[PDB]
């Protein structure tokens, strides 16, 4: 079955310009205090998350080199230490990861 006649632009225009078919505005936009960038109320910041995710790779890269092989996951707890920080007695008996950078302000 094919259309019996051409559909008029006016009829077509009304269909596409009906409110149901139009793009709706969003009121859930929020600001990120940490980075000062926009975010949604139910969505986290990304500018700061970029630092966190990349820092994780840098920390993970250090971990990968230290292990040196697959299936080498330690059976003991692990800790990350940055330059200017010295291991404590409580840190004994735990895998220690050394980071050349200083302790990040956000990281505690």
């Amino acid at each position: 079955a094919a259309p019996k006649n051409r559909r008029t632009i006016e009829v077509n225009r009304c269909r596409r310009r009906n409110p149901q078919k139009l793009i709706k505005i969003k009121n859930n936009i929020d600001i990120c205090p940490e980075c000062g960038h926009l975010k949604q109320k139910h969505v986290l910041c990304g500018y700061c998350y970029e630092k966190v995710r990349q820092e994780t790779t840098k920390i993970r890269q250090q971990i990968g080199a230290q292990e040196g092989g697959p299936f080498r996951a330690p059976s003991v707890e692990t800790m990350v230490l940055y330059t200017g920080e010295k291991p404590s007695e409580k840190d004994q008996g735990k895998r220690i990861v050394e980071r050349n950078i200083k302790r990040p302000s956000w990281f505690t």
């Binding site: 940490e34 969505v43 990304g46 998350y49 966190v52 994780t56 330690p74 956000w106």
Partner: protein, 149 residues
């Protein structure tokens, strides 16, 4: 028609879902923080919490050893669960896993993204939300009400 459903349909079948969940659980244990789709992350959150209980049960438990071996493909992790994860969560009675929403992937599919991590980990803290301080005008007004009461 998803009324009363308590299980998500993932993978190519129920076995694939277990294997896909098994792979996700193994990866999470190794790294302690993994980013995945929100639907899949929610489904696997319950499994991770129960796994910590199995570690708490004890190494000598035959069921735990069988459970740990099946769920963890990489066998180096089996000592870790009983000697790293289980000792860490001994004080905790639950809520071992923290799941939060991440901005959706800009990969042309706009999948809902979430991050699931084990609490008490050595990884850098996630950017968690901070509640409003009591110094705010509304809270201070409520503080005055509290003092009167």
């Amino acid at each position: 028609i998803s009324h009363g459903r308590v299980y998500r349909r993932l993978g190519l079948g129920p076995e694939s879902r277990i294997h896909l969940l098994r792979n996700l659980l193994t990866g999470l244990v190794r790294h302690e923080r993994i980013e995945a789709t929100w639907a899949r992350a929610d489904e696997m959150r319950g499994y991770a919490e129960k796994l910590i209980d199995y570690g708490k049960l004890g190494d000598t438990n035959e069921r735990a050893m069988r459970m740990a071996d099946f769920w963890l493909t990489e066998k180096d992790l089996i000592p870790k669960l009983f000697k790293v994860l289980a000792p860490r969560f001994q004080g905790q009675n639950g809520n071992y896993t923290r799941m939060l929403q991440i901005p959706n992937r800009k990969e042309q599919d706009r999948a809902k993204m979430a991050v699931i991590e084990y609490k008490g980990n050595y990884l850098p803290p996630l950017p968690l939300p901070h509640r409003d301080s009591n110094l705010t005008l509304l809270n201070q007004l409520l503080l005055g009400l509290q003092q009167d009461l």
